[PDB]
């Protein structure tokens, strides 16, 4: 029997990483707007504060944090800030990441940054949060991975390998955290219409993309926010260790 | 931003196969309860009708039909009836199927049966239903596949390969139909506490199953129903060609 | 330590299906030429006889059979012919199959033929052969599946779903047959330069193909024959339930 | 037609990491015995030198080098030495790696270590070696990955995700390098009877492992060596981006 309250986050406290823009922002708004008290972490503090305002006008409860996911020290801080403002953490939404297209001969420092962004931060923040969740009797961690973790193409060595590590960590973390009654899932988005996408997309690339997408349209952040809501809601209580690909049933690549 | 109406099925018409018991019955109820008019199909008309009464008790619109999915004559009948009672078709939830464990030396008749129940029936009904949806401007086809489509084990030649063919149909069919604005997805459930499982499970197998499930509890029909609602709802508008697995982050196998 | 005799089929008897042309032919020649006595089954008897001649001049041992894989009755016959001519069967190479691109609204008879060709024949011949292999203490079955079993595109519903069932049967048959000390593997070829490929390939399609293939070249039957030799040789004695994709590291599609 | 010369490595130059024992030692021997001049690298120079003597005893060309793959300074040294002794590089068999089972609460230092051993080292050496190969007109890079790259279980966060990143590198790297005519592949072995396994295995775990292996015997170094020879030979010329799994058709896990 359908029950609208099971698709809502009433009384849940969520840390949302890289929430000042794009997919991240929409998840924050969609979550707070579904009953969750949200902490908005972003490196661009201005963006982070704007979202909080947006949420508050909407009748939401939000706090801002100027964290850089790529800093162990700023991570444990964000984690402390969250428990202080919220009181507890129930949902971790690891959205921040990145890296992008890089040539085979890129410097190893470039190769390494994608792992800091996409794997190490995600895993370390999970470590910092899990103990709280366990203490409350359960929680949910969701990471925004990528379809690059499944695709094969040129100039994607760093990005694609890092997101693959991110998606597989998910399948395995689901075991270690399952004992603590924590669920871990990820969403793998396709061509989402974001500034991030705009910086690397050419008018022809877009077209090639659209012609390989059955549902002829480019993704909007809400598509990802809608899926994040479901995966983090009590309606998905027996869903763990999964990666949901939101891509119109197609494939969108640059090369 | 969270919009509750996108998670409901108001004014949609759904045909559901094998909805007399287990998983299908709950999808039927959850859907009718979420605003859809449903056609409860099953090879057991008594069961089909009982589900119909319950839906009506809950205040929903529903019609019962006795259809054996393994007959093309019976599938057309099912499509016709659905149309004459509903006036249109917006959603197909192809749930009936089965086959189960079988020795390698099984008669070809038993091997082929698995395909009749899980592949040919499902493909053909989509052929029947597609044109109706197409004219309404789109629709959603959903199939209840299986973890066996990915697992490997002894005594599963017929069952596992057929479910694997069904899961790959979803991926390709998503292309042919993306043009008619029809989305196609599937759900592969783990051990769901239903009589089909109760028929093959034992206390030892039971324990071994829970022994490998991170979220330590067997699945409930509602879990599948919850996922089916999201997948068939407006909120999953850009999700096509996917097979979502509901297994508590683990695997439940017989061996 | 390398040992050339481990990559040879000296004293092995192999049934090669659809061996009168393309990939099939090359496997026959490459096998007989590596020490195996070969039975050449094909529906085009003339082609089947030509290959036998070719093999004999080369100093090979071969027999022809005019079998249609899509006939239970011709299958048990082929199996009997093989044991009579060869004395025993050690290697089953299920190469015959087919079907090709079909539209969503194809007749169900067309949908069903791909399964006869790609799944049912393969599974039934395996049943007919396994008992011999068991009797000898072991054997190897190899099927030629396809990359369509992994790819998603339009007009591939029947072909792609059937080959997927074929590839997954492999993963599972490896269990049932493993007790009998039988190994089951498959090879999934990409754009192999065959008349079969020529009938559905356009000059532009070819180019698109080549530009998505890292090893810029189209496959030759020998590539598949070389891989079949390894998979069926004693050097691969602990390799079972695998599908080796030979595709220059790329993807080759029509749509 | 079968051509034995295509299965040999005559006049090729191969660098092999961690070749002092186990799997790497056997690849070294098999390769030198198949006609290649090899550079036995290992963090244990005694071991490296012992392998060199054996290869020379068997009549092959080989050189020992003490390299700890987790140091960029040491990898360049390894590439330089290989070139000054061999004159060119035709094959890279990146075998050294490791990490193993680790609790979820492990220090980030241990999590990151897994990446140093399985991902960064391997990617960087390919950067070093690629230009050498490129000039000879092509080459082959092969990595010894793992089944953990696909399995899911408890205590494998660091180990499994890193191997998963390495396996996906192979898939993408195959693209960047397909142009230089370099092929990239990997082998994911099951339980191979080597001391690394002997360090983690127990008689009970032993039994459970064989309990799920169709071809009921633990793997031997030669099995991996046999597959590596084929993959790095002229016979696999159109095989790139693949990860071949040698596991006897089953899975050997610790839990
Ligand atoms: N836009 C697209 O097409 C797709 C994006 N993704 C993934 O989605 C995630 C984010 O996507 P978008 O919203 O498009 O990105 P975006 O770049 O538009 O916005 C991300 C937000 O993250 C913040 N940020 C960046 N680095 C940070 C750091 N080191 N520490 C803390 N905050 C940081 C930025 O200030 C920004 O406000 C990434 O993990 C990306 O890999 C995956 C598939 C598609
Ligand atoms: N419960 C479980 O453990 C799992 C079930 N499944 C799948 O869920 C689907 C439904 O199974 P459950 O609800 O568990 O089983 P169930 O046996 O409890 O219910 C099946 C319903 O379908 C009807 N049905 C059977 N054959 C039919 C036919 N030939 N034509 C029309 N209707 C027919 C039955 O009469 C019954 O009412 C199947 O596709 C099965 O493969 C997949 C994974 C797990
Ligand atoms: N050519 C290509 O690009 C690729 C082919 N494949 C697969 O390889 C297999 C064969 O490929 P090709 O050698 O290119 O085909 P082909 O059509 O060139 O030759 C196949 C041989 O099979 C025979 N044959 C057809 N139906 C038969 C039947 N019903 N019973 C007995 N014999 C029959 C034909 O007479 C012919 O001599 C098929 O399973 C196909 O799905 C997979 C990937 C690529
Ligand atoms: N034997 C098994 O059960 C399996 C092993 N593997 C993989 O096979 C590869 C090799 O392992 P085995 O032969 O089994 O192990 P092993 O422990 O028997 O041999 C490893 C060799 O690599 C050397 N080595 C270790 N660290 C090194 C470093 N930091 N730099 C340079 N050389 C180093 C060791 O001294 C030793 O000589 C690894 O990538 C491992 O992940 C994968 C699956 C199974
Ligand atoms: C270029 C930016 C990253 C910029 C940065 O962080 N530096 C990255 C981040 C998200 C990436 C996208 C994705 O993750 C989704 C998608 C994955 C495909 O394999 C490649 C295209 C495509 C559409 C990616 C293109 C490159 C994007 C847009
Ligand atoms: C025995 C019945 C089929 C009966 C029939 O329709 N004929 C089937 C239908 C669903 C099947 C289950 C699933 O599909 C899910 C699961 C998949 C695993 O690989 C094996 C166990 C397990 C738990 C299956 C055992 C057999 C079940 C319970
Ligand atoms: C059209 C013919 C079948 C004709 C028939 O049997 N009738 C089929 C058989 C083998 C098929 C090919 C393959 O199996 C390999 C490959 C798979 C891709 O997903 C589609 C293209 C591509 C290259 C296929 C094109 C269609 C082919 C050439
Ligand atoms: C313990 C050592 C690593 C030691 C190290 O380098 N540090 C590792 C290296 C290879 C590993 C094995 C594999 O990679 C293969 C296999 C993969 C399964 O998912 C788990 C068990 C199993 C059998 C692994 C157990 C742990 C092993 C034996």
Handedness of CA A63, A67, A73, A79 (dihedral sign): positive
Pocket probe for ligand 4: among D16, D17, D20, D24, the residue whose CB has the most ligand atoms within 8 Å is: D24
Token duo for residue D30: 């098999």
Contact by Cβ (8 Å): A125, A78: yes
Q: Which of C188, D100, C255, D239 is nearest to B175 (CA)?
A: C255
What are the residue ranges of helices labelled H in D116-220?
A: 121-136, 157-178, 195-200, 203-211
Question: How would you label C196-217 residue by residue, b for 16+ Cβ within 10 Å and e otherwise?
Answer: ebeeebeeebbeebbebbbbee
**Is residue B159 among the annotated active site residues?**
yes
- Cα C97 to Cα C32: distance, rounded to the nearest angstrom: 22
Neighbouring residues of B139: CB distance < 8 A, sequence distance ≥ 6: B89, B90, B91, B92, B129, B130, B132, B133, B180, B181, B182, B183
The count of other CB atoms within 10 Å of the CB of residue D107 is 10
Phi-psi region of D40 (alpha: psi -120 to 50; beta: other; left: phi over 0): beta
Containing H/E element for C17? strand C13-17
CA distances from C208 to B65, B135, D182 (A): 49, 34, 21
Chain C residues inside the 8 Å CB shell of A156 = none
Cα separation, D157 vs D175, in Å, equals 28
Cα–Cα distance measured from residue D240 to residue C79, given in angstroms and rounded to the nearest whole number = 36
CA C112 to chain centre: 20
Alpha-carbon distance A226 to C146, whole Å?
36
Two tokens, residue A181 = 């009654």
8 A C-beta contact, residue D65 and residue D78:
yes
Query: CA–CA separation, B49 vs B187, rounded Å?
Result: 25
Inter-chain residue contact C215 with D175, CB threshold 8 Å: no
Q: Is A3 annotated as a binding residue?
A: no
In our burial notation (b when 16+ CB lie closer than 10 A, e otherwise), range C59-92 reads: ebbbbbbbbebbeeebbeebbebbeebbeebbbb
Report chain D residues whose CB lies below 8 A from the CB of A104: 127, 130, 173, 176-177
Spell out the domains of chain B, with CATH numbers in brackets.
Answer: 1-255 (3.40.50.720)
Residue A228: Cβ within 10 Å count: 28
Cα distance between residue D159 and residue D166, in whole Å = 11
Sheet holding C139-144, edge to edge: C62-65, C37-41, C13-17, C91-94, C139-144, C182-189, C243-246
SS3 content of chain C, % helix, strand, coil (to 5): 50, 15, 35
Q: What's the DSSP call for residue D116?
A: I
Distance linking the first and last C-alpha atoms of chain A: 46
Estimate to the nearest angstrom the gap between the alpha carbon of A122 and the chain centroid: 9
Cβ atoms of B214 and A177 within 8 Å: the answer is: yes
Method of structure determination: X-ray
DSSP D52-114: HHHHHHTT--EEEEE--TT-HHHHHHHHHHHHHHHSS--EEEE---------TT--HHHHHHH
Q: Are A231 and A172 in contact (CB under 8 A)?
A: no
Measured in whole angstroms, the distance separating CA A57 from the mean position of its chain's CA atoms is 24
Centre of ligand 7 from the C-alpha of residue C100, in Å: 5
Give the dihedral sign, CA D34/D36/D37/D41.
Answer: negative
Cα–Cα distance measured from residue B20 to residue B33, given in angstroms and rounded to the nearest whole number: 16
Q: Which residues contact B199 (CB under 8 A, 6 or more apart)?
A: none
Both tokens of residue C122? 């393969």
Please state, in angstroms and rounded to a whole number, the distance separating the CA atoms of residues B17 and B92.
8
Query: Is C212:C250 a contact under the CB 8 Å cutoff?
Result: yes
CB C79 within 8 A of CB C126: no
Residue D245: enclosing H or E segment and its boundaries?
Answer: strand D243-246
User: C-alpha angle with apex C216: D86 to C149, nearest 5 degrees?
Assistant: 115
C219 DSSP β-pair partners:
C192
User: Cα(A232)–Cα(A115) distance, rounded to whole angstroms?
Assistant: 25
Active-site residue numbers of C? 159
Euclidean distance between CA atoms A236 and C53, whole angstroms: 64
Judge contact between D3 and D82, C-beta under 8 A. Answer: no
Q: Which residues of A touch D153 (CB under 8 A)?
A: 172, 175
Residues in a beta bridge with D141: D92, D184
Tell me which residue has its CA closest to atom 1 in ligand 4.
Answer: D192
CB contact under 8 A, D178 and C230: no
Against chain B, the chains showing at least 3 CB pairs within 8 Å are A, C
H-only helix segments in chain B? 22-33, 45-57, 72-86, 108-115, 121-136, 157-178, 195-200, 203-211, 221-232
Task: Find out whether the beta carbon of C86 lies less than 6 Å from any atom of ligand 7.
Answer: no
- Contact list in B for residue A181 (CB cut-off 8 A) is 215
Per DSSP bridges, beta strands D13-16 and C62-65 are unpaired
Compute CA distances C184 → A168, C58, C91, D147, whole Å: 28, 29, 10, 19
Pair C229, C30: CB distance under 8 Å? yes
CB of residue C99 inside a 6 A radius of ligand 3: no
Q: How far apart are CA A158 and CA A106, in angstroms?
A: 9
From the CA of B196, how far away is ligand 6's center (Å)? 7
Tokens of A101: 């297209």
A-D C-beta contacts closer than 8 Å: 111
- How many CB atoms within 10 Å of residue C137? 9
- Start-to-end Cα distance in chain C: 46
Q: Which conformational region is residue A54 in: left (phi greater than 0), alpha (psi within -120 to 50 degrees), or beta?
A: alpha
Q: Which of B69, B104, B177 to mutate to test the interface with C (most CBs of C within 10 A)?
A: B104
Cα–Cα dist D153/D113, whole Å: 20
Please give the Cα distance from C102 to C200 (Å, whole number).
Answer: 12
Interface touch A247/B238, C-beta < 8 Å:
yes
| Residue B73 burial (C-beta neighbours within 10 Å; 0-12, 13-18, 19+) | exposed
C-alpha angle C207/C211/C215, rounded to 5°?
115
Stated as kind and residue range, the H or E segment containing A16 is strand A13-17
d(CA B159, CA C169): 9
Per DSSP, B70 falls in state T
Residues of C whose CB is below 8 A from B72 = 108
Inter-residue contact A82 to A15 (CB < 8 Å):
yes
Which residues, including other chains, have CB under 8 Å from residue A29's CB and lie 6 or more apart?
A51, A54, A55, A58, A60, A225, B1
Chain mean position to CA C14: 12
CA of D197 to the centre of ligand 8 (A): 6
How far does the centroid of ligand 5 lie from the alpha carbon of residue A100, in Å? 5
- DSSP-based three-state secondary structure for A83: helix
Mutate to test the interface with D, among C239, C243, C246, C252 (most CBs of D within 10 A): C239
Are residues A101 and A54 in contact, defined by beta-carbon separation less than 8 angstroms?
Answer: no
Query: A193 in the Ramachandran plot: left (φ > 0), alpha (ψ -120 to 50) or beta?
Result: beta
Nearest CB to B58 within list A1, A183, A214: A1
Q: Which residue has the least CA distance to atom 23 on ligand 8?
A: D191
Q: Rounded CA gap, A48 and A26, in Å?
A: 12
Yes or no, beta carbons of D250 and C237 under 8 Å apart = no
Q: How far apart are CA A212 and CA A204, in angstroms?
A: 13
Q: Which of residues 159-178 of A touch B (CB under 8 A)?
A: 174-175, 177-178
Nearest ligand, CA C99: 7
Q: Which of C219, C222, C238 sits opposite D248 (nearest CB)?
A: C238
- To 10 degrees, what angle do helices B108-115 and C121-136 make? 140
Our separate counts of H helices and E strands in chain D read 9, 7
CA–centroid distance, B156 to ligand 6, in Å, is 9
CB D217 within 8 A of CB C238: yes
Residue C98 alpha carbon, nearest atom of ligand 3: 41
Which atom of ligand 8 is nearest to D148's Cα?
Answer: 19
The atom of ligand 7 lying closest to the CA of C200 is: 1
- Pseudo-torsion of CA B71, B77, B79, B82, nearest 10°? -130
With CB atoms and an 8 Å threshold, state whether D112 touches A105: no
Among the options D63, D120, D122, D159, which is catalytic? D159
C78 touches chain B (CB under 8 A): no
Q: How far apart are CA D249 and CA D16, in angstroms?
A: 27
* Contact residues for A107 (Cβ-Cβ < 8 A; gap 6+): none
Beta bridge pairs of residue D126:
none
Place of tokens 């991240």: A24
Phi then psi for residue D164, to 5 deg, are: -65, -40
Binding-site residues of D for NAD(+): 23, 42-43, 68-69, 95, 159, 163, 192-194
Q: How far apart are CA D132 and CA D90, in angstroms?
A: 8
Those residues whose C-beta lies under 8 Å from the C-beta of residue B235, and which sit 6 or more positions away, are: A226, A227, A229, A230, B6, B7
| C161/B173 Cα distance (integer angstroms) | 10
Residue D201 contacts by C-beta under 8 Å, 6 or more apart in sequence?
D191, D209
What is the rounded CA–CA span in Å between residue C247 and residue C224?
10
Resolution, given in Å to one decimal, reads: 2.3
Task: Name the strands in the sheet holding D13-16, side by side, starting at the edge strand that comes first in the sequence.
Answer: D62-66, D37-42, D13-16, D91-94, D139-144, D182-189, D243-246
Please identify every residue of A annotated as catalytic.
159
Give the binding-site residues of ligand 1, using a 6 Å CB cut-off. Answer: A 18, 20-24, 42-44, 47, 67-70, 95-98, 144, 146, 189, 191-192, 194-197
Report the C-alpha gap between C101 and B176 in whole angstroms: 12
The three-class DSSP label of residue C29 is: helix
**Cα(C118)–Cα(C145) distance, integer angstroms:** 8
Please say whether the beta carbons of C253 and C196 come within 8 A: no
CA atoms in the 13 A half-sphere facing the CB of A121: 31
A: neighbours with 3+ CB pairs under 8 Å? B, C, D
Planar angle of CA D212, D213, D217, nearest 5 degrees:
130
């Amino acid at each position: 029997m359908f029950n609208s309250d099971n698709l809502r986050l009433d009384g849940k406290c969520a840390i949302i990483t890289g929430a000042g823009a794009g997919i991240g922002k929409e998840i924050a708004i969609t979550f707070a707007t579904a009953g969750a008290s949200v902490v908005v972490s972003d490196i661009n503090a201005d963006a982070a504060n704007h979202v909080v305002d947006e949420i508050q006008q909407l009748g939401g409860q939000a706090f801002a944090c100027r964290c850089d996911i790529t800093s162990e020290q700023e991570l444990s801080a964000l984690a402390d800030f969250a428990i202080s403002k919220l009181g507890k953490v129930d949902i971790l939404v690891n959205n921040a990441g990145g890296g992008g297209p890089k040539p085979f001969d890129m410097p190893m420092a470039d190769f390494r940054r994608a792992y800091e962004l996409n794997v190490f931060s995600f895993f370390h923040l999970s470590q910092l949060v899990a103990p709280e969740m366990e203490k409350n009797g359960g929680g949910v961690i969701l990471t925004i991975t990528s379809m690059a973790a499944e695709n094969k193409n040129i100039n994607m060595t760093s990005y694609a390998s890092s997101k693959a590590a991110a998606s597989h960590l998910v399948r395995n973390m689901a075991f270690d955290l399952g004992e603590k009654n924590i669920r871990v899932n990820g969403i793998a988005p396709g061509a989402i219409l974001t500034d991030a996408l705009k910086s690397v997309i050419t008018p022809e690339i877009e077209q090639k993309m659209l012609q390989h997408t059955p549902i002829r349209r480019l993704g909007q952040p809400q598509d990802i926010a809608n899926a994040a809501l479901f995966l983090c809601s009590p309606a998905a209580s027996w869903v763990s260790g999964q990666i949901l690909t939101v891509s119109g049933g197609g494939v969108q690549e640059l090369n």
